[PDB]
């Protein structure tokens, strides 16, 4: 089953801002998760063809991945840190919806999420 167009990483008519919190989300939260040993399946949109997951986009109607989030952060797509945090939460939730508890990909998601919650705990107050 085939791949949809990926989520946008630009949108000229969407409002956006730069904040120290969004910068922390790029410099710290994304960079740290990206370098983890379990990050690779989350670094790009799910390719349902290559991975032989033909049901994926029958079940996941709001897909999200850290490649997308990385480009959104780099391109100043967001209005505030909350919009970005939702994207990470969408990514994790999709994983938990599509797969079974304790599947390898779910353990990977859980490790990344643990780390995510740790880094978000030190999100600086908006300056
Ligand atoms: C997080 C999106 N994603 C990327 N690859 C995935 C998935 C997924 O949700 N379920 C999957 O089954 N696979 C394939 C897969 C399965 C196990 C491992 Cl260790 C890696 C990828």
Helices (H) and strands (E) in the chain, counts: 6, 0
| Token pair of 63 as six digits | 């897909």
Of ligand 1's listed atoms, the one at least distance from the Cα of 98 is 9
Residue holding tokens 């370098």?
A: 35
Of ligand 1's listed atoms, the one at least distance from the Cα of 38 is 19
**Method of elucidation:** X-ray
The resolution in Å comes to: 1.6
Q: Would the CB of 112 count as within 6 Å of ligand 1?
A: no
Alpha-carbon span 78 to 57, nearest angstrom: 25
Task: Pick the closest to residue 88 from 113, 107, 61 (CA basis).
Answer: 113
Alpha-carbon span 4 to 65, nearest angstrom: 14
**Residue with the nearest Cα to atom 21 of ligand 1?**
41
The answer to whether residues 26 and 64 touch, using CB atoms and an 8 Å cutoff, is no
Question: What's domain 19-123's architecture?
Answer: Up-down Bundle (1.20)
Measured in Å, residue 105 CA sits from the centre of ligand 1 at 5
What CA–CA distances, in Å, run from 122 to 45, 65, 85, 99, 119? Answer: 28, 22, 14, 30, 6
Measured in Å, residue 43 CA sits from the centre of ligand 1 at 11
Q: What is the DSSP letter of 3?
A: P
Domain map (residue ranges) of the chain = 19-123
3-state secondary structure of 40: helix
């Amino acid at each position: 089953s085939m791949n949809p167009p990926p989520p946008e990483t630009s949108n000229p008519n969407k409002p956006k801002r730069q904040t120290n919190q969004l910068q922390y989300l790029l410099r710290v939260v994304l960079k740290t998760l990206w370098k983890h040993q379990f990050a690779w399946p989350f670094q790009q949109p799910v390719d349902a063809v290559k991975l032989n997951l033909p049901d994926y986009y029958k079940i996941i109607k709001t897909p999200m991945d850290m490649g997308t989030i990385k480009k959104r952060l780099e391109n100043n797509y967001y209005w505030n840190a909350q919009e970005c945090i939702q994207d990470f939460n969408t990514m994790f939730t999709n994983c938990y919806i599509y797969n079974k508890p304790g599947d390898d990909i779910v353990l990977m998601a859980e490790a990344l999420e643990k780390l995510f919650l740790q880094k978000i705990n030190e999100l600086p107050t908006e300056e």
